[PDB]
Ligand binder design. Structure first.
Ligand code: NAG
Lengths: 49, 49
């Protein structure tokens, strides 16, 4: 660890890239599924012709 | 016997192997430090540099 202390920039950029990917996954899910702002409920009656 | 005490106090602490994140101001003097491995917040500050 004391030897690796001089590669802090390399580790910081690695963790930054991975954190960006991780946030991007949640963003992708939000764009795909969270388009509708209201949670509509199915009607009790299913008279859909 | 026959003597009186002074009016001075002292404090002793013990150094340990620790990782620190020091800050140098424009004039070259160390103005602040973060103790890596103190608490989770300091750990985050020390991970993100
Ligand atoms: C740095 O030095 C200059 C001139 O000595 C002074 O104007 C300034 O206040 C100093 N800044 C700090 C943070 O000590």
């Amino acid at each position: 660890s004391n030897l690796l202390l001089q590669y802090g920039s390399f580790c910081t950029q690695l963790n930054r890239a991975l954190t960006g990917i991780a946030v991007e996954q949640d963003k992708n899910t939000q764009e795909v599924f969270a388009q509708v702002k209201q949670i509509y409920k199915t009607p009790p009656i299913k008279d859909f012709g | 016997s026959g003597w009186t005490a002074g009016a001075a106090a002292y404090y002793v602490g013990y150094l340990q192997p620790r990782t620190f994140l020091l800050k140098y101001n424009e004039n070259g003097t160390i103005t602040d430090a973060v103790d890596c491995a103190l608490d989770p917040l300091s750990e985050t500050k020390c991970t993100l540099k």
